[PDB]
Amino acid sequence: TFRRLWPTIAPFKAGLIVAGVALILNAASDTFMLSLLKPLLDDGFGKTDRSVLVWMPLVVIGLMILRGITSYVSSYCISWVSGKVVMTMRRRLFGHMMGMPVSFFDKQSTGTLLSRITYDSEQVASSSSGALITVVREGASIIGLFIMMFYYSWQLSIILIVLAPIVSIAIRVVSKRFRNISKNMQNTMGQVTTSAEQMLKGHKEVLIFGGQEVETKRFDKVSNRMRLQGMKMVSASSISDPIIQLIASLALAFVLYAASFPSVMDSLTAGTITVVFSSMIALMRPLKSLTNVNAQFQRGMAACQTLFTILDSEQEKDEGKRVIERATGDVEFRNVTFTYPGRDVPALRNINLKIPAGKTVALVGRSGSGKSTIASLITRFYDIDEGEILMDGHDLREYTLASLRNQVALVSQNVHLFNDTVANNIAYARTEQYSREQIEEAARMAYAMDFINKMDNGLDTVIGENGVLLSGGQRQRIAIARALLRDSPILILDEATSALDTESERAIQAALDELQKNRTSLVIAHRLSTIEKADEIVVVEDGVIVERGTHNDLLEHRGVYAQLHKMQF
């Protein structure tokens, strides 16, 4: 196909014309070495004055140091252009996949999606520059061995391109008739292999009816039939070869015969026949690799469509209306329902919920009724299907996504810590505005100063993976510190795991309670300590909220909240 990949290659056009000037000389330095068999065999060995054997070693090494220097220059000027186009393309893939809908990463997976910037992204330059040092290198040793063949003796070298195709079609139509004959009788052997299978199945009938010496005298007759049939498809294959060498041997019985009549011989000497025939066997390695130049350019440039689909997919919906400085209000769900893209059954049906100002709510769908699903919608990770969610008395879809997610922080047990310093992972993405003094204040407020003080360099230790490898308990307290520093009004505390690792858990529990003073909170509760203190507990009954009320109004009525209370016990 024709592709729009060239504009990325076009700036790096200085390495694609030095790997073609210093790569033709790698093919014109091999065609110039086969030509040294003429002065060697003709007038270097036969006669006396052995000066063409002291002159020649300096020329076979001189054409092998020039074949090395011209092969390391054609592999550094094609790996500098095949390494700067698989770098300005991987950057584009990791500048568009960081802005797609969250629903895309699921249904794809992190591992498989990393195979489109590491494996099927160098295949666009490992099988498109590998089909350019094969049509320029092995397409220049064919125009080098054709003007070396004709230069020496056009009489013998023009007979070798009139018998070359005639021999090459008599080898194919002879090798083809023994390929449908060895395939015709191949299916005949399938009618006896199955005939053996139709007697191993009825083993229980072989025994019960007393027939054991009768079923064995039938495998003395159907095993003797796939031997003779197996001995016929090897006699049709061992006749396939001797008579494509005899057809090619008659080719080397007319060239020798042809070069004995006076006009078409002249004097072809001892050289000028080991250079015209040795050139004709070195000419057949380029010709069996110049055929696979569109079967390799369609295997590299066909992998430039599986990643140009990703590069041209739809990004997130950025329908923005207004900038929200601070969400000094309440978040209201009003008859909202949606399903995950990928599943068919509805996940959460029509729901009406409200998060008042300066208050907190709880969601206990612990059986697995999508209680975690009311955390993605407020952040617009997954877009709603029907209904409306209003923040500060206005729909979420109005605001810009940049200014909406700014007013939200997801504190949870699973937090991805970047491979950076702890002074950055505490103030990630806004290290410019916030000073180092405030970062210490945030950490001390979170009561996470103990772990950071234990670090070697304090507020500069590499904290992410391939670093100091903090444990799971310490990761959470950094998230509290991170959320506290930015002062995001909304709060969607996960608290999924109710650990009992005291001291560490006491600090986490004490630290979390400090965060929930202002800053309207949603808690997807698994720990019963913080369920009862909430202003208004709510429970997700499958797809819709059914039971709503404080801790005691919902317990006097049985419903399922009370049973959920007994499930905890």
Next chain:
Amino acid sequence: TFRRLWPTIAPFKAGLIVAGVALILNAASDTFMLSLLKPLLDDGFGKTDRSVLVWMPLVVIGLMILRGITSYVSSYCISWVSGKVVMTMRRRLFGHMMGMPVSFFDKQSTGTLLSRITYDSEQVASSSSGALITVVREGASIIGLFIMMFYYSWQLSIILIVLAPIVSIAIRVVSKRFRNISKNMQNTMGQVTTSAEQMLKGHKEVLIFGGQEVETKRFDKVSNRMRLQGMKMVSASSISDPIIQLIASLALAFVLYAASFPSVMDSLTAGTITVVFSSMIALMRPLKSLTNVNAQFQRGMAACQTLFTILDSEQEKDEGKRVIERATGDVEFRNVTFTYPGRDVPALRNINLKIPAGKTVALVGRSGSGKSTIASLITRFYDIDEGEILMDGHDLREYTLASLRNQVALVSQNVHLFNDTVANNIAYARTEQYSREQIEEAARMAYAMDFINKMDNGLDTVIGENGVLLSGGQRQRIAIARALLRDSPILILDEATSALDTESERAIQAALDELQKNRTSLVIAHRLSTIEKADEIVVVEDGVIVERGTHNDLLEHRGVYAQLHKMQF
């Protein structure tokens, strides 16, 4: 190696000592053609003597016809010994896999067991004659090319055996140093790829925290390292080939330089330097192919152990030699427990069942476990764990296995039919004693005569697979016919048909009712009609005989027989 396969080949020492006489002659025809280079390049392709090109083309034809005739005789005389030592192993394999316990056939191998007759029995004579063609052909091809190289010139052919290991060890130790550097530099790419991986995972954290530019200004540094550490791996691999080519070209330079010194060291004639310098080129294929001889003789004699394990295994327990002619008695189960091999959970605990003379029993329990297992034990398809099964006043172990299994007939919907004319399929394994008139009478009594007459030749049409073929009802009726003809005085109906095809089910039911006059019946029950008309009914579930009684006496007590009607109704 164990090589106890040799006794099966010892009778065939007539192809193996012709494929070594007509193969040394094939190897000594690729050596007598390279010796046609010295007369050509020396004594008639560079002189007025235009006669060596007149008798030579016909000598190439007369040596390539000889090569073909000596290569086809060495492929027909070793495909005849590779055929009669595999055909005589696929008669001991299918002469021992037809008398072993049924449990071996059930699930340990169902369709893969034919790979031991078709694939792993041909992979023993296809990689043990391919490691003898490649050690007598290409082990004489390096004696021919070692004597031709020494005869033409012993001074230049001894500076190619003393000067070749120097080159080989140098190439190997130069390649090892660039192979363990390209592997030390390979792990840095992994350590960078994982660093790139550890930012694709936290996409939700990349979005919610607002940092979309830090993550793309960090990939500009993580991917700018990938190209610099990737092109290093190319620069450290494109230096290997240019150096190990120069090391090999230096040997060529030194060999040519050696011939310069005429102080009794070299006197060649320009054809001796093409017969000696081309044999060395043609002496490396038969040295690369001779290394992979013990890598093929153990890939074709280790797969011969998979056959010798299946062979020489434990056949069925033939203990006991008591003789029984006709079981004119009753089968009396008494406190028998049995479990399938390959599992530990009891499939059938202690049962006590009775099969009196001239009586029938229905083993209902249609839930799908326990009832089916109370038919294999009578025929000793599976041995019993504990307890005793008593037939005609004595245990089954005492009687000979041949004399027991002939006393029972398994009539079932799923019946195997052999690939023979209907004449044997009705009288299988006893076509001698039983006459054709008796077969016709049995077919008439079974009311299968309508279909058999509908066949072209009557009682001579191939009735199994790859033949006339039949519907399930006709197969069942043929099973009834052969059961009637054999006149075995025990009967075990499966009767899992549940068919409702009128005019076929009518005949099947009539024939079955005619069959159950004599021949005490153990009728597995799915259709209620046979359950009604019977002597005694027994219910088994999980090996628990729970309800025993007649159709009416067992209904007033609910239990499960009252529920059995509720299953249908």
